From a paper:
All the crystals of the dimeric form of the c-Src-SH3 domain belong to the hexagonal space group P6522 and show a single chain of the c-Src-SH3 domain. The intertwined dimer is generated by symmetry, and the structural motifs of the SH3 domain are formed by two polypeptide chains: residues (N-terminal)–111 from chain A and residues 117–(C-terminal) from the chain belonging to a symmetry mate (thereafter, chain B in the intertwined dimer structure). 3D-domain swapping of the polypeptide chains occurs as a result of an open-like conformation of the n-Src loop (Asn112-Gly116) which acts as a hinge loop. On the other hand, in the Q128RD, the longer side-chain of arginine displaces W3, while W1 and W2 are placed at the same position; and in the Q129KD the sole water molecule conserved is W1, which is placed at hydrogen-bond distance of Lys128 and Glu106. Thus, the amino acid at position 128 is responsible for the hydrogen-bond scaffold around those water molecules. Interestingly, W1 is the only water molecule conserved among the different structures: it shows very low B-factors and small ASA values in all the structures in this work. All the intertwined dimer structures described at this work show the presence of a PEG molecule at the interface of the two chains forming the dimer. Whereas the WT did not show a large pH-dependence of the Tm, our results confirm that: (i) the mutation of Gln128 to arginine or lysine, which bears a positive charge, results in the stabilization of the c-Src-SH3 domain, since these species unfold at higher temperature than the WT; and (ii) mutation to glutamate, which bears a negative charge, results in the destabilization of the c-Src-SH3 domain. However, at temperatures below 20°C, we did not observe the formation of high molecular-weight aggregates after several days.
The non-receptor c-Src tyrosine kinase participates in different signaling processes by phosphorylation of tyrosine residues in a variety of proteins, modifying their properties, such as enzymatic activity, subcellular localization and stability. The c-Src tyrosine kinase is made up of six functional regions: (i) a N-terminal fatty acid-acylation domain, (ii) a unique domain, (iii) a Src homology 3 (SH3) domain, (iv) a Src homology 2 (SH2) domain, (v) a catalytic domain, and (vi) a C-terminal regulatory domain. Of all those, the SH3 domain plays a key role in the regulation of the tyrosine kinase activity through the recognition of an intramolecular Proline Rich Motif (PRM) and, additionally, through the interaction with other PRMs present in other proteins. To better understand the mechanism of 3D-domain swapping formation in c-Src-SH3 domain, and its plausible implication in amyloid fibril formation, we have solved the crystallographic structures of the WT and three mutants at position 128 of the c-Src-SH3 domain.
Numbering used by the authors:
A (entry chain A), B (entry chain A): 84 to 139
The structure:
């Protein structure tokens, strides 16, 4: 299961990956799952969250 | 489309969201899409990437 970078991306944090268009990438499996941008109705705060940590 | 936090999560970076179990969350749509942990076969580097930036 291999992918390829459509555009350049420069990292904005210490945990993301910088790459250039054409690079070949493999998805790594982690226990955290996909990450989503979320808004907390409880706190009003907003930011990325690990999918597996929540349920509908 | 609302979810609820199964576990506490403490933020590790400046972009993720800290929350506590039971919090209610709403997914925000961004152009970047889901984020995945990836390994670059081209560079050997590893880190999170925005889904929409790549194709199989």
């Amino acid at each position: 299961m291999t992918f390829v970078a459509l555009y350049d991306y420069e990292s904005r944090t210490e945990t993301d990956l910088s790459f250039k268009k054409g690079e070949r990438l493999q998805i790594v499996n982690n226990t955290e799952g996909d990450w989503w941008l979320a808004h907390s109705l409880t706190t009003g705060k907003t930011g990325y969250i690990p999918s597996n940590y929540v349920a509908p």
